[PDB]
Point group: C4
Chain length 245, copies 4
């Protein structure tokens, strides 16, 4: 149990550091940051996390992915709290890590103040916030479908009965999938397909002086990246089992 | 037969969702969309589809590719209607999926109206439309050569007698080929090398309120991405068999 | 001998079509072409060519690479004319292919005239031309070092005694090497590390109506991409054999 | 000992040539250079170096990585001076190589003068310099954490007891890790995670006429990329051994 917790903590921390840094690069600097880099930062950050903890715990790095495996009988329910606790600690510490490494850049870009919304907003480095045009229930649809897209492809990639990725190379294919999810479907909600990617960094920003507007922004958008991916991952998983399986 | 139909439906749906989303990103948003992302979205969307249905049906995901295999004796002719029906349903539902996920973005960008042509045109997200400078018969040449380029390389990648891609990794190499086809030869016609990629999304847009101009645009360009890839894929296939084989 | 000639012709044609198209995209269109796409177009165009002819002829696709192998005893000298003839025909026909597929785009961009130099120059799509600041003998240094960089890495990638790329995946690693050669060292001379990539497209443009300025441009620069890579590839090869071997 | 020295010299030279060229492209040219290309240039330059010397010496190509292996008992201490001497010579000669290949471009861009700081600064092509907003001790934190991130992931990728990358393909995964380190965390200090990447090119620029300001810039920043990565690599290594091991 301890080894599984440590594996999930380290794998989530590695992935979240790479993902949050790429978002920080895009938000803070123009000539060093791009949306493609954000997709590459999050996508291949998963690949490093898979190498870290793929054999010990499976490197879920995702509360929705862990929930789907537990709800589909692949992983015992008694390990679900341990996986989520490991991912939440790893993401929270990754957010603190990015804050320390980019503290001067965040202060220089924003100008001392930490604003959730505005032209110098820096809260979006850590958590995802709904755009102006999009609505909460459209964001729920986007979050669930994107997590279902990930879980269906995740099952196909690592299904030994089906056509799998070559063992020892599945980490790269998983990273490619995360890269193209952000590329193709990630502009509507910030593709927070991971509840561990969204809430722990949001809790950090509230503590780190960004204020309570992190939760109240977008008509209380904060809960959607926590609940919608769980439904989407479950739905994406059962569809694969019914159709392909 | 049912399993083969389901495999082609799911693999086409996964690939088309990734491909159409990347096109939607490029069309709707500047800071989140790029032509390279479109090539990455379509290219590695194929890779996910190959993992989904490569062992069950071969993951053709392409009516031209299916036609070439059937016309060259590799796949029975009786399965051609099943493969095409699966790909057409998967592409049509993928177009509806992209419409729902990007409905607010499409409405915000266009301004409520759905126009095939103009500065706020949104019909190009789903189907390919001929540019102003290019002609229909030049588009026929581009569509046939590009599909022949794909089919010749597809045969080489998955030819066990020749120098193949390593089994279990052929999905990545296939995705790379689709990425570089859009990069190098995809600006002239939108590289609709797949009849399933073009017609079903075009039928959806006509139903979804874009009007009958989807078919009448470009001097009735709609039929070229359906007929030209079939001739190109066949020609690309026989050339590989004669020369390399 | 015939099979080896056909393998070199087809592999060069596939690679050169992808490479020239990516250059055409960058030259003709801004929103669809980028220097990174040119590196991706040429780099992974090699990968497709390796899958085509890697087992039959080794897929040299490069007169300098063929010369180095022949001069280092790895390939018989009697096959050198056959490899070069195959690569020259494949590159010449690839240039004609790109001319037909981009004829309307080239005419629209240039405005009917075909100019070697100027703001609407289109001769650089096919052959490489020296920039204004660079000199001929500095270009000779760049061409030889870049080909030596390629040949040293090519030997390391496909050296079974050394640490090789995994068999069946060496095509991807070769393509990666070509991608990063253009990324890191390709802006000074256009990284025409292949004599087959430079001269046959230059001969085509002279025939295709661009005039005799294709050869006289840059103080008769045309011969440097033919002679310098041969010296560079040989020097890069012997260095690897002495040091690593 | 001689073979190990030659392997480290050649592998470092290959990687540093690709890395420095990509930085030169970004600094000197806008339409041919980008920050993503710099990450690709350094990242997959490591991959070529791994193929060169991975079996002979392990292809550390990094004084911090060599120090961590020696301090953790994986590599004898008597070989540490040989690895560092090989990497320092390979990086110094790579800097001279880039100077010769880009001499006309550097002269044209800067205008004859070689300035460490200013709008036409060219000293950043070879060595990393602290930005205006960042401080020396914040740079120390960035350099140590980034090297710890690399070493922890490097151990996971090449840990046969853990979940490894597939043998024969570990070079690509190592290159991917270096690519995403620059993408996500490389804008604060230039991600000089390698003491061999920083000091030898800095010594070259001082000799090559850039003056003594290369060492005095940023309140004597030159020593931080030499000392901080050693502490970071050691700390990143022991953490992996305690937690994952
Ligand atoms: C293989 C595919 C896997 C897919 C798995 C995920 C599937 C998810 C299905 C459940 C999603 C439910 C979302 C319901 C959203 C309904 C409301 C909606 O679409 O917005 C309606 C609008 C509301 O805007 P307003 O301004 O308040 O008025
Ligand atoms: C290995 C290579 C595989 C290649 C396979 C595909 C090969 C395709 C060959 C068949 C293509 C036929 C296209 C014919 C087009 C002819 C007309 C043409 O080029 O445009 C002519 C122009 C017409 O313009 P206008 O304004 O109406 O006058
Ligand atoms: C492992 C490394 C592999 C490397 C292999 C290739 C090595 C190539 C060595 C041979 C290259 C020879 C180039 C000589 C160039 C000398 C002249 C030169 O550098 O320019 C001098 C300048 C001339 O300009 P101007 O305006 O006319 O005066
Ligand atoms: C798995 C994780 C691996 C991580 C390994 C590396 C860990 C590194 C730990 C040691 C880093 C020590 C850095 C100390 C820096 C302290 C000072 C600091 O943060 O800046 C403080 C500020 C100073 O600015 P001023 O303008 O002079 O005032």
């Amino acid at each position: 149990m301890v080894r599984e917790f440590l594996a999930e903590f380290m794998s989530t921390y590695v992935m979240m550091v790479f993902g949050l840094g790429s978002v920080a690069h895009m938000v803070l600097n123009k000539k060093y940051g791009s949306y493609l880099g954000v997709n590459l930062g999050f996508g291949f950050g998963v690949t490093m996390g898979v190498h870290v903890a793929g054999r010990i715990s499976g490197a879920h790095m995702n509360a929705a992915v862990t929930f789907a495996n537990c709800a589909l009988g692949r992983v015992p329910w008694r390990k679900f709290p341990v996986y989520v606790l490991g991912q939440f600690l790893g993401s929270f510490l990754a957010a603190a890590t990015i804050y320390s490494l980019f503290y001067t850049a965040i202060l220089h870009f924003s100008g001392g103040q930490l604003m959730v919304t505005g032209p110098v907003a820096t809260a979006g480095i850590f958590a995802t916030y709904l755009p102006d045009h999009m609505t909460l229930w459209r964001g729920f649809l986007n979050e669930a479908w994107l997590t279902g897209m990930l879980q269906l492809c995740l099952f196909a990639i690592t299904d030994q009965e089906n056509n799998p990725a070559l063992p020892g190379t599945e980490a790269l294919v998983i990273g490619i999938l995360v890269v193209i999810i952000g590329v193709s479907l990630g502009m509507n909600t910030g593709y927070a397909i991971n509840p561990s990617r969204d809430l722990p960094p949001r809790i950090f920003t509230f503590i780190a002086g960004w204020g309570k507007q992190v939760f109240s922004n977008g008509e209380n958008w904060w809960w959607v990246p926590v609940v919608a991916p769980l439904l989407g991952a479950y739905l994406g998983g059962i569809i694969y089992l019914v159709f392909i399986g």
